[PDB]
Amino acid sequence: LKAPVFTVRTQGREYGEFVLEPLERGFGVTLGNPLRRILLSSIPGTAVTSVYIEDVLHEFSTIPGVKEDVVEIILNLKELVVRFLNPSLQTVTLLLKAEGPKEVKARDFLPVADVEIMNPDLHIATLEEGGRLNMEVRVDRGVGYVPAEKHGIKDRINAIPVDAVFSPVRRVAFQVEDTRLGQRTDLDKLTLRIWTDGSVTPLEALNQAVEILREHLTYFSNPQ
Amino acid sequence: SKLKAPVFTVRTQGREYGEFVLEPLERGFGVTLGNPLRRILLSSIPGTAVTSVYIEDVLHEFSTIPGVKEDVVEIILNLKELVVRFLNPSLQTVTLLLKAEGPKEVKARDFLPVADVEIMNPDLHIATLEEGGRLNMEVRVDRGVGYVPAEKHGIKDRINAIPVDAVFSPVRRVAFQVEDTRLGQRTDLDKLTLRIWTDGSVTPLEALNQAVEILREHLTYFSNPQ
Amino acid sequence: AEPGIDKLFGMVDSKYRLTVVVAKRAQQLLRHGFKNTVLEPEERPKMQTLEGLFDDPNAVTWAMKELLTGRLVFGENLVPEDRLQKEMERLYPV
Amino acid sequence: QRDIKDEVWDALEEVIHGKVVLLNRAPTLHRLGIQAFQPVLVEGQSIQ
Amino acid sequence: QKRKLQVGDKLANRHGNKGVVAKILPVEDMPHLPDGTPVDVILNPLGV
Amino acid sequence: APIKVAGRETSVGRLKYVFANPDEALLAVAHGIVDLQDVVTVRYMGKRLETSPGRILFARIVAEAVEDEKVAWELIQLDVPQEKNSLKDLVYQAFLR
Amino acid sequence: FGKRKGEGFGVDKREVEVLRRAEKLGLVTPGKTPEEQLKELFLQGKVVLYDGRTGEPIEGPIVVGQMFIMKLYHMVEDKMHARSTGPYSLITQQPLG
Ligand SMILES: [Mg+2]
């Protein structure tokens, strides 16, 4: 029973590959499957939960003077990666006002203290001459994935609830393969692939997941 | 809002069976905890099994004993069901002795008692002997992990010893239920109930603690990257 | 699939001519102990043992990799055959 | 067979590196009844 | 010799489904009933 | 269920669930919001498409295997379930290009 | 099942997910208690099955039961054979069979 070797290969803040081998027979899927469930359900992140646009009644309306439809604008907002620098910050409202002939990017949101926009070049909407965009978007701290028709957040009337993609983890794929040390051939080799949006780093994401699991193991203490 | 540490309930019945509840847990964590513990519980939990047999006047497994109804193949097959608990954690090997005669049905009790070893199933049938039937044997019982087949260990106490298939694992069955529950603010939370059956050398609760400990120890390996 | 096999079939008028160039090249390497290679130390194919990394013993793997570089010249009637053998045994002994 | 030590298996692994073997199954009806494969050593008596 | 079942030995039922044992999974990988009982054999439905 | 809302033919699932990119669609499936055989609205490579998350996943399998996303999108017939013939065509078409 | 209801356990979360998939298949009748639907599947010879690797259910009910299976006389130990060099025939000098 040796000490497994742990190996990391990273490409910046959105991707890393993590290989742990050798493990005893069966343990490749015993760690990977629980870690994968955690990496998807429990990693804390931020998401656009609600949006108000001035002259827009509902989600399926079209905006005069703006090329994208309302759905398309919400879609782009689902993309936006916002990073809360303040450990205590549980929510923020971001404001944007612009008009005339300009293609509106992420940078245009009015800067807020302790709110970092990671992807400032992200396109939001193209505005033609005399097209007008005035909007407030609500950004909350959370985990996992909550469809809009289920969290139901409205700050005011006409505010549209947005499907909330909290998880900084975009995908987790893991592959187990047979491997041998000397005479023992039935051993496991675990390869983990983690994709994030850049707010949480892939190595960071794993460590948080591993930490959560250890804590859950402690729940096997004071009985009844 | 973030859920807080759940209540852990324990309903053990004897040394054989237990039910282990954890409530309330975040949605989907019922199986996130339940499944890896079952895998570790069925495989990596140490236990005891018969590894070798020497029967007097027997050179190999395919023999047959005068006065005995059962063939040696069946005799070793019955000794493979023997559950032997070591009270002293430092004791890795013993040797049980049995001497029987006359019109008796030898059961597991008839083994000569040894200190710090308790036979958890003293009613198990071993051999049916008939008037004039005799039987003197030495069974070597060991502590180990997993399933080690006879060809692998090849354990022989003397020249005429017969290697035996070893099922070390004390865990006979593991199931776990995941049921719906709420903290009254939030819904679709998970209530996890682990059912653990054992042979008695180790206890359902003891298994669960060892399983969690293996899983904990495994997560440590992620510390030092490269 | 052999690595870059499609590019190798590109280099020849007949797939069987590729096999001959590769096969003959591997024989050149084995007879001379690899020291006539056109590869550089980091391009050398490696083999992972229990000890650790060593040179790939398989000369046929080598020959295909060498071919891909572009440093080999193949054709008919390039040089009298016997004279080639002496010049190679002179430059890279046995 | 008992005189075979475990270092001999590592020795064979070095030998077969990069080489291929031929698989054939009868009847060989067309040219694909034989194909080449790079072998992966396995315990056990079966061809995979 | 005592022969344990191994990979490559051949099994069949009485209706003509016949096949060779290609994999032996540890009990923890076997599909199981809710009450914890694992199954013994997994047969592909494509044979029916 | 097939329906006509505003004369065009769509389904309830296409309206309820509209996903910005593929990674999100499979994240919804991972959380049991939709299954892979559910028709849903997904935005992939500049187009707003009506398909299942499964058909998006299949196109990605093809896409990552050949490490060419543009060519990969061309070969597949996405609007149909993959069966023996389409997959056979895919192998041939992938072989040529 | 009755053993379970008396033992103090109710229907599982995963058994519901499979039942959801089963009513889309027309296997169980919509609008019945989980026990009523599980028995409907059990009369079709199908049960809920958990994958030991994941812990998640098989997305559908699976046929499970007791079958009689025999071990036939063709065993690899008898059939595996290989030769480097060996015996030759008298006239032809080719390897033996
Ligand atoms: Mg929607």
Give CA–CA dist C35/G39, Å, rounded.
76
HEC readout, B166-200: EECCCEEEEEEEEEEECCCCCCCEEEEEEEEEECC
Chain E's closest residue to B173, CA to CA, is E36
- Ordered domains of chain C (ranges, CATH): 1-94 (3.90.940.10)
Nearest to A201 by CA among A166, A224, A169: A169
Q: Can you name the CATH fold of A1-44+167-220?
A: Gyrase A; domain 2 (3.30.1360)
Give CA–CA dist F30/F53, Å, rounded.
11
Spatial contact of D43 and A185, defined as CB atoms under 8 Å apart:
yes
Q: Are B26 and A41 in contact (CB < 8 Å)?
A: yes
Which one of B35, B37, B41, B43 makes the best mutation probe of the G interface by having the most chain G beta carbons within 10 Å?
Answer: B35
Nearest CB to C61; choose among D10, D14, D18: D18
Token digits of residue A199? 């707010």
Which F-chain residues 33-52 have CB contacts (< 8 A) with chain A? 33, 43, 48
Nearest to G21 by CA among A154, B126, F17, F36: F36
Give CA–CA dist A119/A112, Å, rounded.
15
Please give the torsion angle defined by the CA atoms of residues B207, B208, B209 and B213, in that order, rounded to the nearest 10 degrees: 100
Cβ partners under 8 Å of residue D31, min gap 6 = none
Spatial contact of C55 and D15, defined as CB atoms under 8 Å apart:
no
Q: CB contact, 8 Å: D3 with chain A?
A: no
Cβ partners under 8 Å of residue E42, min gap 6 = E30, E31
Chain E's closest residue to D44, CA to CA, is E7
Give CA–CA dist C18/C26, Å, rounded.
12
Spatial contact of B72 and B62, defined as CB atoms under 8 Å apart:
yes
Residue extent(s) of CATH 3.30.1360.10 domains in chain B: 1-46+169-222
In angstroms, the separation between the Cα of residue D36 and the nearest Cα of chain A is 23
State the distance from the centre of ligand 1 to the C-alpha of F15, rounded, in angstroms: 6
Chain E's closest residue to B35, CA to CA, is E28
- B61 phi, psi to nearest 5 deg: -65, -25
Residue extent(s) of CATH 2.170.120.12 domains in chain A: 45-166
Experimental method: X-ray
Q: Are D6 and A185 in contact (CB < 8 Å)?
A: no
Give CA–CA dist C86/A162, Å, rounded.
79
Cβ partners under 8 Å of residue B186, min gap 6 = B1, B3
- The two most distant CA atoms of chain B are separated, in Å, by 77
Phi and psi based region of residue C4 (left: phi greater than 0; alpha: psi -120 to 50; beta: remaining): left
Spatial contact of B190 and B27, defined as CB atoms under 8 Å apart:
yes
Nearest to E8 by CA among E26, E20, E23: E20
Task: Tell me whether chains G and C touch (3+ CB pairs under 8 A).
Answer: no
In order of B1, B203, E38, G58, the CA distances from B17 in angstroms are: 36, 8, 18, 27
Cβ partners under 8 Å of residue G61, min gap 6 = G18, G22, G27, G41, G44, G46, G47, G48, G49
In order of A3, A12, A17, B144, the CA distances from A203 in angstroms are: 20, 10, 9, 37
* Class of CATH domain A45-166: mainly beta
Output DSSP code: residue G28: S
Spatial contact of F16 and A149, defined as CB atoms under 8 Å apart:
yes
Which B-chain residues 159-218 have CB contacts (< 8 A) with chain G? 177-180, 190, 193
Q: What share of chain B is helix, strand, coil (3-state, %, to 5)?
A: 20, 35, 40
**The domain over range B1-46+169-222 is classified in CATH as 3.40.50.150:** no
In order of B63, E13, G74, the CA distances from E4 in angstroms are: 19, 19, 13
Other Cβ atoms less than 10 A from the Cβ of G82: the count is: 4
Cβ partners under 8 Å of residue E17, min gap 6 = E43, E47, E48
The residue behind tokens 């099942």 is G1
Give CA–CA dist A163/A146, Å, rounded.
6
- The chains found to touch G (3+ Cβ pairs under 8 angstroms) are A, B, D, E
CATH number of B47-168, picked from 3.30.310.50, 2.170.120.12, 1.20.1270.30, 2.40.160.20: 2.170.120.12
Give CA–CA dist B183/B7, Å, rounded.
12
Catalogue the long-range contacts made by B67-72 (C-beta closer than 8 Å, 24 or more residues apart): B67/B129, B67/B130, B67/B131, B67/B132, B67/B133, B67/B134, B67/B135, B68/B127, B68/B128, B68/B129, B68/B130, B68/B133, B68/B135, B69/B127, B69/B128, B69/B129, B69/B130, B70/B127, B70/B128, B72/B162
Resolution in angstroms comes to: 3.1
DSSP H/E element including A124: strand A123-127
Chain G's closest residue to D46, CA to CA, is G76
Paired residues of F1 in beta bridges: none
Residue extent(s) of CATH 3.30.1360.10 domains in chain A: 1-44+167-220
* The amino acid at A31: L
